[PDB]
Ligand binder design. Structure first.
Ligand SMILES: CCNc1ccc(C)nn1
Ligand SMILES: CCNc1ccc(C)nn1
Ligand SMILES: [Cl-]
Ligand SMILES: [Mg+2]
Ligand SMILES: [Mg+2]
Ligand SMILES: [Mg+2]
Ligand SMILES: [Mg+2]
Lengths: 194, 194
């Protein structure tokens, strides 16, 4: 019943553009929407985000997250490791790459989502969420070597999976950080399960 | 270590703007970022709310109440938690209960409310509160709930059992052209991983 008629470019930067989308509403009346798109997509999706489950024997299972300065937020955020998928890279390969770059961990793929939307009222941005396990007892994960790209500046924060939401709430209370909505949604469901 | 130096307006729409952010990197070098922001945030603790609505009915498994709508940025239909922007002077809890009623018909009860969490922090400053709400599906108020959509809102309700949420979302994605929201997928994943 609803569909795009046309798009008008409002403004294009190097990395993002602003568009005005004309669409047909289900009554048959034409309407407009201001939308953002990245300029970088080719690709199943813009990005991957990695849910990294760090498994060490005789330890709690942890979820590995990253803290970075985020210029649109004007502050530090706690997020799943993540980045844009390179042209001709599969989402799986992007996930293992980004996790290795951002955390130094070498992980194994468990599952991969379809493309999911980031903020569909605002943007067309999509990611694959990739669940990866990390065998923390393997020598290659003993002293994990994070390889920042140019201008990345990433702190690794591992939190126990069994208490994730409480630990995130503490960091927020004590550290004036912003938690990512997908991290927080995952932490919620861990508590809400059963 | 890192902070904002300046924020230059590039293009301002009615609803969204593009900015050139200048910031200090942790090597002490000045850099830039193209950032997105809404034009609509005043003194609210966040742009918006998304509601995690847990429908509870005696001798039923608990459902997560989701909504499906056309999203012009995506050029298609999306399945999301019920959500909307916080009106000026409105509390996040009031916004969540109001949006839930407007989008689904249901009258909920507040369970918990997150701090402001970031939607897509590499792209935008957009934040929400994630508000968990229980819906007493045994109350006659919630028997034959009718959405009260606003002008240009056209929302379908989809309630799926919590205990099978990921597979039920996969089956919807298998059956039509639609995208699942990354917060919903995240939450459905954690329900599986717990
Ligand atoms: C980022 C949201 N953009 C919007 C919202 C409403 C309307 C009418 N147009 N554009
Ligand atoms: C929406 C992403 N904006 C960006 C990304 C990278 C750089 C250097 N600048 N701006
Ligand atoms: Cl897992
Ligand atoms: Mg990244
Ligand atoms: Mg990286
Ligand atoms: Mg809405
Ligand atoms: Mg609404």
């Amino acid at each position: 019943k609803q569909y795009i008629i046309s798009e008008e470019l409002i403004s294009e930067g190097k990395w993002v553009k602003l568009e005005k989308t004309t669409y047909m509403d289900p009554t048959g009346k034409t309407r407009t929407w201001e939308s953002v798109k990245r300029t970088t997509r080719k690709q199943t999706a813009d990005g991957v985000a990695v849910i990294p489950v760090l498994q060490r024997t005789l330890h709690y299972e942890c979820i590995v997250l990253v803290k970075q300065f985020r210029p649109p937020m004007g502050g530090y955020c706690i997020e799943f490791p993540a980045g844009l998928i390179d042209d001709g890279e599969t989402p799986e390969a992007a996930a293992l790459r980004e996790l290795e770059e951002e955390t130094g961990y070498k992980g194994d793929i468990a599952e991969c989502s379809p493309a999911v939307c980031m903020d569909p009222g605002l943007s067309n941005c999509t990611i694959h969420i990739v669940t990866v396990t990390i065998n923390g007892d393997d020598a290659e994960n003993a002293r994990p070597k994070p390889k920042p790209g140019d201008g990345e500046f990433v702190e690794v924060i591992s939190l126990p999976k069994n208490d994730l939401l409480q630990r995130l709430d503490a960091l927020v209370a004590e550290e004036h950080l912003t938690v990512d909505a997908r991290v927080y949604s995952y932490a919620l469901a861990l508590k809400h399960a059963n």
